[PDB]
Amino acid sequence: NMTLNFGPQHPAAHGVLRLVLELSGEMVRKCDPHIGLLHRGTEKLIEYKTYLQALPYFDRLDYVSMMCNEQAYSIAVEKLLNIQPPPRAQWIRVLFGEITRILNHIMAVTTHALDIGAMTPFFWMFEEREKMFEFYERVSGARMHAAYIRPGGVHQDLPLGLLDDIYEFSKNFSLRIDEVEEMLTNNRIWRNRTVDIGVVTAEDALNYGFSGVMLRGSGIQWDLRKTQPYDVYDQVEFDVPIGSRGDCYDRYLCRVEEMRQSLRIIEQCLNKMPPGEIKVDDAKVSPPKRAEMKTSMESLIHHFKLYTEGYQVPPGATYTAIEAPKGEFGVYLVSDGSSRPYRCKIKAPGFAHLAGLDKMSKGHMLADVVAIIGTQDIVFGEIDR
Amino acid sequence: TYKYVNKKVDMKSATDNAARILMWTELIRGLGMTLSYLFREPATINYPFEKGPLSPRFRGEHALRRYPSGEERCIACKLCEAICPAQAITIEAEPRADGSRRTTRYDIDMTKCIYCGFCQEACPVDAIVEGPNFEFSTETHEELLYNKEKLLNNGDKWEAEIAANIQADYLYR
Amino acid sequence: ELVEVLKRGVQQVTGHGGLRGLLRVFFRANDIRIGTLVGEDKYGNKYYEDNKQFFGRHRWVIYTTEMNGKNTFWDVDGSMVPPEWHRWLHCMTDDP
Amino acid sequence: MWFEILPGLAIMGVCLVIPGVSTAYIHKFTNGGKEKRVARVQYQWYLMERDRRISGVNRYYVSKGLE
């Protein structure tokens, strides 16, 4: 049983993963993934920071999916305060929530192929990604790591003109997804390296807490977005892409299908986004508008206290989970009455998925392990936190 | 509402299958797609000559602004220090002889800074702003640490564009 | 069709002054294209914008030698463009 | 556009024809304007050698009916 460290710096291994492996022949006898090569303290650091200054940590937890993560903390802090965002903000979060799902799937499908050896899909879709980033930048200011979705709504209304461009792009992106399919969906070779690799049973997927496409790929029907609606994902209409004969190829097809379904959700959001405000009107939770803080005393006091001290969330604890592109992203945020949190365990769709690597890659070749790490969309930020 | 992504022997059917298997058709299909793009205009930009577009809210590099008269805007309320997530900004102040309130030392550690843009948000006089420039890569680590004089100098150099950028986005804020 | 494609290539080559002038543009940028000159800033710099080209490349600046006496003809730097014209180049503002 | 991959190819092509034209003219120069005899089998080497003996020392020189 030859032992070998897949290696932190592996061109294939996403980020840095030391996958100590015992390989009988080329077959992988045992898979003991090592983690923490990217532990950084995100959970302890948050205890020493106020709610609004811990929002930027969430973007960094799994930064492929920059915003969708922010929505989970937002929702969580809103629940604890029993405040809910204004109607326009909700649609925004679903608009950028979905755009972000595409961004993650373009990452997951194209990076999967680069490890497999197909390199042209990545360049094709990274150009589309690029175009999306620009939406982020023109809405938040940052290409990624925006900090746009804050605990009481979004930070600033969309620029005057973004919606139109999030249309032109959406109107075309489909063809770009179509092109990739041609090369891979039916490549006489993609199928082989992906089909019947890492099959996970339905009962086993629920047991190991997979909770993501990984469950959906095995045929279990669960989309937290339809089962437990958050924001206004209830008012839209989309089809969960369930899969059968769950294997690397089937789940892939599912991720390409949610890229397709997210364009259906984005279209609607553009078609039906309401006129209104983008942040709660409670100066108590949301910072006052700058014209107001510069002309009204109560607004300055509320601006000064909010930025310097904080929300002062009422004491309680909540576990709120959304459907981040990877899977169920949840924040268990225990909170004392103080302005800074007490605990914030981030449930990472990924801590559970990696664990499954062992029960998925059994009697498999070195190349199979590379394919399976891809079909779990492992971003070491969320796993290591 | 759910959907089945991959739910699913006549001679013709079998023969066509064999045609694909032995003539590698689905492989030739893939080659056609790449040949097609070879003919598309590539999307790259000459980086020094042409620059990727950044709109007014781009956070980029920190600068401290001054009033048109010439009085630096910062009045050392020090809540930019309070809301800095990374502990980057260090401010110590004392009453200037004028009697006014000014910062003796304002040090943004850019390596500590994660460019969140909250400081831009928090300032009441809006003295500290996220300036447009993103190209400030430096040979030595010390250069990245910035004192009041570098930021004020950064502010003077980019004030014209900073003013235009704040002009465009203030209604939104 | 392609003959008009060829005439466009000839005009681009003739566009940059003499044979020596295009050789100079050829070496420092590696791209030959002709555009209206929007402005020349006081630090030596020349800016051109073409509506026909795609969003990424429709605005370009051809840097000039010694803009602060640095021998900048070969070591072109992004920071050389002045702050006033930086936003025009990055498409922050449409107005020149 | 794609116009630009051609420069490089041109320098490949030009460097793949040289060899074929070169080998096929450094032969017709050294052998007196007549293709280098290919002696696959001995008979041919014999005939070739016979030619050498017939004139000068080199086989390419070829005597005719006027000898």
């Binding site: 179509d178 | 598309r40 | 969003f55 | -």
Partner: peptide, 28 residues
């Protein structure tokens, strides 16, 4: 763009659909 009407047809024939309608070059 700037397909010239022949590179475009090789593009359309090879792809099997009209890229002209959904181009990679965003325009005004």
């Amino acid at each position: 763009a700037s397909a010239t009407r022949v590179i475009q047809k090789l593009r359309n024939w090879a792809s099997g659909q009209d890229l002209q309608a959904k181009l990679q070059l965003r325009y005004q």
